[PDB]
Structures are given as C-alpha cells and as structure tokens.
Design a protein around this nucleic acid. Structure first.
Ligand SMILES: [Mg+2]
Ligand SMILES: [Mg+2]
Ligand SMILES: [Mg+2]
Ligand SMILES: [Mg+2]
Ligand SMILES: [Mg+2]
Ligand SMILES: [Mg+2]
Ligand SMILES: [Mg+2]
Ligand SMILES: [Mg+2]
Ligand SMILES: [Mg+2]
Ligand SMILES: [Mg+2]
Ligand SMILES: [Mg+2]
Ligand SMILES: [Mg+2]
Ligand SMILES: [Mg+2]
Ligand SMILES: [Mg+2]
Ligand SMILES: [Mg+2]
Ligand SMILES: [Mg+2]
Ligand SMILES: [Mg+2]
Ligand SMILES: [Mg+2]
Ligand SMILES: [Mg+2]
Ligand SMILES: [Mg+2]
Ligand SMILES: [Mg+2]
Ligand SMILES: [Mg+2]
Ligand SMILES: [Mg+2]
Ligand SMILES: [Mg+2]
Ligand SMILES: [Mg+2]
Ligand SMILES: [Mg+2]
Ligand SMILES: [Mg+2]
Lengths: 119, 88, 101, 73
RNA sequence: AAUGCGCAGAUACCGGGAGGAACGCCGAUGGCGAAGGCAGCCACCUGGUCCACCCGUGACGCUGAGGCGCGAAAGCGUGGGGAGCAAACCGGAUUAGAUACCCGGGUAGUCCACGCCCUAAACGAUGCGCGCUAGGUCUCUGGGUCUCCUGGGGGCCGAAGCUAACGC
C-alpha cells in the first residue's frame, strides 16, 4: 500500500535461475521473485518458462502497489533473460526503457576454474 | 640525462684538433661520461638489470678502445687515463 | 627545466571567497617549487562523465608551466594535499600531432 | 561488407593529443565508453595508438566515461 | 543432484565504507627486449634501437674454453600482506570401485620487500658474425623528388637451389 506507479525492474539472469526484483525510483525493492519462488526446484529455475512466470509473478505482486511504469535493467548473461523481458512487457506494466547493465571487471579477480579454461 | 651542452664541454675538453668528434679520446671520454651516470644510477636502482647490461657494453666498448689506444700511442694512453681516472 | 601542463580539478561547490583561496595556494605552491608560469586558462566548471567525490560536476584549471624536472612529483604532491583539490594531472607538453587536418 | 560510417571522416582539423577536447574525443567511443576499434575510427596504426593514450588521460580527468550502459535489449 | 548458505532475514536492489589483487575497450594480423619476458594513467631515473647528413677516428674487427651476470613457474628463508583463487586437506556427488574428473569448503601458495634456488616444450625444438644468390605481396617504423623510390622490422607465396621427406 505504498503507492509508487513509477518503478524499476532488475532482471538478474543466470544459467541457473532468474530473479526479478521490483523497486521504487530510488532503487529500494517493492517486491521480488525468481524461479524458486514459483515452486520450481533444480534445473528448471533457469528454464525461460520459469523466467516468464518469475517476471509475471513479480509484476502482479507490484501491480498491487499501483505500479504502471517500469524502467527495465537486464543484468545477466543467461537463458530466460529476454523471456523475462517478454513477460514484463506483456503484463500491461508500461516498460519505459530497457538497459543492459551486466557488470564486467576491467580484468580484475581471478575467476573460478570452471569459468576460464584458457584464462 | 646528459644535455647537448653538457656533452659539448666533454668533446672540447678531449678533442685533438678543433671539430674533432670521433678520435679515440673523445670516444673514451664520452663513454666515461656515460658509464659514470649509469653506475650512479644502479647504485640506487640495483634491481634494474636491463640497464645494467647497457653498462657492461659501455665498459666493454670502452676497455677496448683503450686496448687499441694503448697499442698505438702509450703517450696518449697514459695521458687519457691520468686525465680521466680509469684503472682503479 | 621542462614544459609541463598541470591539470587541477576543483570542488565545484565553493563560493567566491573559498575558490580564489585555493587558487592562491595553487599559485603559491608553484612559486615555492620553481614553476615559472607561462600561459594559463581557467576553463570554469564542466559536467563530469562519472561523479568525482559524489559531485557530478568539477571546477577546472590548466597551467602551462616550465619547472625543474627533479621537483615535479613533489610539486604534484603538494597540489593534491588539499581537500577541494579533486584531481591533479601534471602532463609534460608535446607538439600537437594533428590528424586528418 | 563490414563498413558503415567512418569517424576520421565526420571530423577534420583535430589534435589527437588534446585530452580536453571532449566534444571531439567522445565521437571515438561506442555507446558504452569503449574505445572504438580501428575499423570504425578509421585512424591509422599510429593515430589510434596516440588517441587511445589521449582518451585514457581524459577518462582520469573525468571528462570521458570508462564504461556505460547499453540501452535496447 | 546433494553437501553448502538463508527467519541471528540470505539471494535480488539502492546508499556508504574497508581492503587485496588484476588492468576491459584500444588490442593484433601489432610493438619492445639477448633470452627469461614486458600491457590502466602520470612523473622521474635509465638500457637498446632506427633513419638522414656523409662531419670525426682509421681495421680500433668476429667468435669466445673458463669467469662473471641475467634467468617463466614451482620451491626455500625472514618479515609483511591476504580480496579472488587454490596442491594438500575436509565434505557432497559419480562409479563396479573413484585416493579422479563434477559440486561446496579450504591451508601452503599465488601479492610485496629483502636473500636463496638456476629448472623448463628456457621452442623457431633452427649458435653468433659477414658476404653472395629472381620476384610478388601484406604490415610496423624512418627518409627523399612522396603516382613511386630508399632504409630498419614483422608475415605470407614463390626463382634458382637444398632436403629422407615434410618442408626451407
Ligand atoms: Mg540448514
Ligand atoms: Mg522469525
Ligand atoms: Mg552478495
Ligand atoms: Mg554495495
Ligand atoms: Mg582485510
Ligand atoms: Mg624478436
Ligand atoms: Mg614466449
Ligand atoms: Mg634512449
Ligand atoms: Mg667522412
Ligand atoms: Mg686521415
Ligand atoms: Mg660476444
Ligand atoms: Mg628464477
Ligand atoms: Mg615465483
Ligand atoms: Mg615465501
Ligand atoms: Mg610468509
Ligand atoms: Mg600471517
Ligand atoms: Mg574444488
Ligand atoms: Mg573456493
Ligand atoms: Mg625475489
Ligand atoms: Mg644455467
Ligand atoms: Mg647469411
Ligand atoms: Mg608519409
Ligand atoms: Mg622486409
Ligand atoms: Mg616479434
Ligand atoms: Mg624448385
Ligand atoms: Mg643438410
Ligand atoms: Mg620437394
């Protein structure tokens, strides 16, 4: 019952899950959701279908704080990334602008072995 | 560094005739100018090995011009060293 | 002596009194460090590409100098020692390599 | 194939060493802060080497970005 | 998948702080170095090199047993540091078994100073120097009369020729 109307959607994409946080224009979360929140368990949380629900769930949850307009900020490499956007669009919520903000070091920390092979 | 003018006074102080820029002395004098800077450099920056190689080559190029000069005119030889301060 | 370009980014927030206070120390520190000052342009303030010390703006300064090489790093230190002095960038001068002109 | 608008062309009489000429420098970065390749700047082997050093300096002054944010997806 | 972390409220998101390590794009088909090897930016201090002029010296040259110095990584000593990563190790899985591959942790170490160690697929698996023997072409970097000439460097294709062949 905060009332916000205008807000932000952070899609956190990953080869392993998808997590959608909705926030106010300052960045503080109104509500969130993910593959695990829609009752999926293992590999299926990375599945883009999951990502569709995960976004839709997170939407509706926020559409009851009277949201209408969202700035989208995609932030991950994974599957179910664009589908999380697709879901966000088709939820009536006006998507005012999508931005990729995947964080990337200017070569900094020694990565996990799994993620380097040939460096 | 060694500026143009710094370097001049060395060539004048050591040239056989005016405008001479490559007699044995002028060269040995010049290298000594060079060696002395560099040896003062590695006194401080002793981990700078790459430079240190330059140094063996200066010394090398030098303690060879002298070997020749001492073969040709020991007059000029005993002269150059007394004038500088080599052999120590 | 060599010809450097001393870049100083100032706190954009200071009213008149506080500003020319810093300038006085800037130019003083130059006099003390043997910085004969050739040309000089105070380009005012400009919008920064990213924030520097929480400010989205920065007050700019540029000094073309001629000063003793052996005294440059210690001169750059002294310039940075202050608060409202955000960046100091002392570059040595170059011939302007034109291109496509 | 592999050629659109070249950047050395859109401009004219500039100094590649001028690390304050933001209005000119910034034409050489992508939408992200990333310094454009030669195949898009249109600089020669050398010009590019000098511009990259120039852009880098201009980033430290806070005139040019280091990295920005893609705006479509 | 499970160990694991999470109601002592994690994950996701915003703001502030600490620290350690590495330097995205540019950037490679590129450059520098005797080799090892060298990549954010600035300054200082230094080494090698290349061109033009055709000014100086006048064979002062080449190689080089031994000697001396340098020498990835790992490893060692003393002190410091310790983000991420990670031999050993501790667990979870997998398997017939699993002292492994996969997963969650994790010490030495990886970092810095100083002192050792002296190895390598330390590779172009090709000692250094000088002379001679078609050309084409791409590229880095100088110079001149700059459609082209003329240096130095890095590739490719190829004359003669060489080679057990591959290839050069
Ligand atoms: Mg538990
Ligand atoms: Mg409770
Ligand atoms: Mg976290
Ligand atoms: Mg934070
Ligand atoms: Mg700590
Ligand atoms: Mg080489
Ligand atoms: Mg190598
Ligand atoms: Mg030099
Ligand atoms: Mg002559
Ligand atoms: Mg003669
Ligand atoms: Mg030899
Ligand atoms: Mg070693
Ligand atoms: Mg080591
Ligand atoms: Mg140790
Ligand atoms: Mg220790
Ligand atoms: Mg300790
Ligand atoms: Mg492990
Ligand atoms: Mg770990
Ligand atoms: Mg050591
Ligand atoms: Mg040996
Ligand atoms: Mg030969
Ligand atoms: Mg030209
Ligand atoms: Mg060639
Ligand atoms: Mg090479
Ligand atoms: Mg043949
Ligand atoms: Mg043979
Ligand atoms: Mg044959």
């Amino acid at each position: 019952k905060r009332q916000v109307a205008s807000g932000r959607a952070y899609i956190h994409a990953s080869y392993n899950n998808t997590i959608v946080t909705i926030t106010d224009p300052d960045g503080n979360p109104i509500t969130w959701s993910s593959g695990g929140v829609i009752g999926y368990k293992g590999s299926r949380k990375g599945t883009p279908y999951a990502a569709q629900l995960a976004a839709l769930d997170a939407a509706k949850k926020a559409m009851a704080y009277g949201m209408q307009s969202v700035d989208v900020i995609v932030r991950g490499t994974g599957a179910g990334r664009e589908q999380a956007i697709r879901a966000l669009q088709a939820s009536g919520l006006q998507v005012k602008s999508i931005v990729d903000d995947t964080p990337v070091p200017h070569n900094g920390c020694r990565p996990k072995k799994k993620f380097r092979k040939a460096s | 560094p060694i500026t143009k003018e710094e370097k001049q006074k060395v060539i004048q102080e050591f040239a056989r005739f005016p405008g001479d820029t490559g007699s044995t002395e002028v060269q040995v004098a010049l290298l000594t100018l060079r060696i002395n800077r560099l040896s003062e450099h590695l006194k401080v920056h002793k981990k700078d090995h790459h430079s240190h190689r330059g140094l063996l080559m200066m010394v090398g190029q030098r303690r060879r011009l002298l070997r020749y000069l001492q073969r040709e005119d020991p007059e000029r030889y005993r002269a150059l060293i007394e004038k500088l301060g080599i052999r120590g | 002596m060599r010809r450097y370009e001393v870049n100083i980014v100032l706190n954009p927030n200071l009213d008149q009194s506080q500003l020319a206070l810093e300038k006085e120390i800037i130019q003083r520190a130059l006099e003390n460090y043997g910085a004969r000052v050739e040309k000089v342009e105070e380009l005012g303030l400009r919008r920064l590409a990213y924030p520097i010390a929480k400010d989205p703006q920065g007050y700019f300064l540029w000094y073309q100098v001629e000063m003793p090489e052996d005294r440059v790093n210690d001169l750059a230190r002294e310039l940075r020692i202050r608060d409202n002095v955000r960046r100091v960038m002392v570059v040595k001068s170059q011939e302007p390599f034109l291109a496509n002109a | 194939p592999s050629r659109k608008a070249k950047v050395k062309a859109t401009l004219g009489e500039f100094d590649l060493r001028d690390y304050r000429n933001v209005e000119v420098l910034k034409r050489f970065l992508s939408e992200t802060g990333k310094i454009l390749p030669r195949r898009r700047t249109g600089l020669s082997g050398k010009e590019q080497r000098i511009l990259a050093k120039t852009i880098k300096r201009a980033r430290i002054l806070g005139l040019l970005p280091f990295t920005e944010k893609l705006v479509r997806k």
